[PDB]
């Protein structure tokens, strides 16, 4: 999973880009819900929030380090099939 750091400028642009609805506005920055963040695996070749963030505030979350198989498994859980 990714996470949004303290560099977030609360610009809103990443929220509509997430295929899983993992991003929402928090207290002081936007926040990724890790159980919904597949790092876009299953939907896109790369993370869509990272592509749009203007200040590079979105990084790997080391407390939710996931393999590709885990991220694809999470995509399958979220979307069914
Ligand atoms: S990496 Fe993909 S799944 Fe994770 S929060 Fe960003 S847009 Fe959503
Ligand atoms: S795109 Fe980047 S700066 Fe804008 S709300 Fe999302 S994480 Fe924060």
From Swiss-Prot:
[4Fe-4S] cluster 2 binds at residues 18, 37, 40, 49. Keywords: 4Fe-4S, Electron transport, Iron, Iron-sulfur, Metal-binding, Repeat, Transport. Its cofactor is [4Fe-4S] cluster. Residues 1-28, 30-63 form the 4Fe-4S ferredoxin-type domain. Pfam families: Fer4_7. Gene3D superfamilies: 3.30.70.20. GO terms for molecular function: 4 iron, 4 sulfur cluster binding; metal ion binding. The keyword 4Fe-4S applies. One of its GO terms (cellular component) is cytoplasm. [4Fe-4S] cluster 1 binds at residues 8, 11, 14, 53. Ferredoxins are iron-sulfur proteins that transfer electrons in a wide variety of metabolic reactions. This is Ferredoxin. It comes from Allochromatium vinosum (strain ATCC 17899 / DSM 180 / NBRC 103801 / NCIMB 10441 / D).
